[PDB]
Motif scaffolding. Structure first.
Motif, mmCIF file in Angstrom:
data_model
loop_
_atom_site.group_PDB
_atom_site.id
_atom_site.type_symbol
_atom_site.label_atom_id
_atom_site.label_comp_id
_atom_site.label_asym_id
_atom_site.label_seq_id
_atom_site.Cartn_x
_atom_site.Cartn_y
_atom_site.Cartn_z
ATOM 1 N N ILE A 24 -9.730 7.659 -4.331
ATOM 2 C CA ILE A 24 -8.308 7.967 -4.272
ATOM 3 C C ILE A 24 -7.559 6.650 -4.409
ATOM 4 O O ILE A 24 -7.802 5.713 -3.647
ATOM 5 N N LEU A 25 -6.695 6.553 -5.417
ATOM 6 C CA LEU A 25 -5.967 5.323 -5.707
ATOM 7 C C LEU A 25 -4.574 5.283 -5.103
ATOM 8 O O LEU A 25 -4.063 4.186 -4.833
ATOM 9 N N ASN A 26 -3.948 6.438 -4.867
ATOM 10 C CA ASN A 26 -2.582 6.469 -4.359
ATOM 11 C C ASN A 26 -2.324 7.854 -3.792
ATOM 12 O O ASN A 26 -2.472 8.852 -4.516
ATOM 13 N N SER A 27 -1.968 7.922 -2.514
ATOM 14 C CA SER A 27 -1.701 9.166 -1.818
ATOM 15 C C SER A 27 -0.232 9.305 -1.442
ATOM 16 O O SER A 27 0.154 10.321 -0.859
ATOM 17 N N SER A 28 0.599 8.327 -1.807
ATOM 18 C CA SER A 28 1.984 8.257 -1.354
ATOM 19 C C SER A 28 2.818 9.460 -1.772
ATOM 20 O O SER A 28 3.825 9.749 -1.128
ATOM 21 N N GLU A 29 2.440 10.164 -2.832
ATOM 22 C CA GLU A 29 3.283 11.195 -3.430
ATOM 23 C C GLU A 29 3.180 12.531 -2.708
ATOM 24 O O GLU A 29 3.977 13.425 -2.996
ATOM 25 N N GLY A 30 2.238 12.687 -1.784
ATOM 26 C CA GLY A 30 2.156 13.904 -1.011
ATOM 27 C C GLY A 30 0.985 14.759 -1.418
ATOM 28 O O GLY A 30 -0.168 14.371 -1.230
ATOM 29 N N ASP A 31 1.267 15.923 -1.987
ATOM 30 C CA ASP A 31 0.217 16.868 -2.330
ATOM 31 C C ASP A 31 -0.426 16.597 -3.688
ATOM 32 O O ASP A 31 -1.329 17.334 -4.078
ATOM 33 N N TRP A 32 0.050 15.607 -4.439
ATOM 34 C CA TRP A 32 -0.613 15.121 -5.643
ATOM 35 C C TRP A 32 -1.038 13.668 -5.429
ATOM 36 O O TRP A 32 -0.221 12.791 -5.104
ATOM 37 N N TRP A 33 -2.320 13.411 -5.622
ATOM 38 C CA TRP A 33 -2.926 12.112 -5.421
ATOM 39 C C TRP A 33 -3.378 11.548 -6.753
ATOM 40 O O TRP A 33 -4.019 12.244 -7.531
ATOM 41 N N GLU A 34 -3.121 10.265 -6.988
ATOM 42 C CA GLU A 34 -3.725 9.564 -8.122
ATOM 43 C C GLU A 34 -5.173 9.219 -7.774
ATOM 44 O O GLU A 34 -5.443 8.639 -6.716
ATOM 45 N N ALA A 35 -6.120 9.617 -8.634
ATOM 46 C CA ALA A 35 -7.535 9.481 -8.332
ATOM 47 C C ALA A 35 -8.295 9.112 -9.607
ATOM 48 O O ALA A 35 -7.838 9.405 -10.734
ATOM 49 N N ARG A 36 -9.437 8.441 -9.430
ATOM 50 C CA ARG A 36 -10.370 8.210 -10.530
ATOM 51 C C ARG A 36 -11.607 9.039 -10.229
ATOM 52 O O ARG A 36 -12.202 8.926 -9.143
ATOM 53 N N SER A 37 -12.003 9.876 -11.177
ATOM 54 C CA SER A 37 -13.266 10.570 -11.039
ATOM 55 C C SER A 37 -14.424 9.604 -11.246
ATOM 56 O O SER A 37 -14.469 8.869 -12.236
#
Length: 63
Positions: free
Chosen positions: A31-44
């Motif tokens: 998980i790269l960024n969780s700041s946005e709430g229910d959508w997380w920036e992630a790398r598979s």
């Protein structure tokens, strides 16, 4: 910290927007960024691709 904190996909997801990431059940993510709430920036860690994922579709691995 000495390694990635892993999350795992519970369900399949098909991308449909500009910046979201498709994935199948069982893929693992950093998980790269969780700041946005229910959508997380992630790398598979399975496909190497990066984008937004729905946070309700994943859970921590060591769980």
């Amino acid at each position: 910290s000495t390694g990635v904190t892993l999350f795992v996909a519970l369900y399949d997801y098909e991308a449909w927007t500009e910046d979201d990431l498709s994935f199948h059940k069982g893929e693992k993510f950093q998980i790269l960024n969780s700041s946005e709430g229910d959508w997380w920036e992630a790398r598979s860690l399975t496909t190497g691709e990066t984008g937004y994922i729905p946070s309700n579709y994943v859970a921590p691995v060591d769980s």
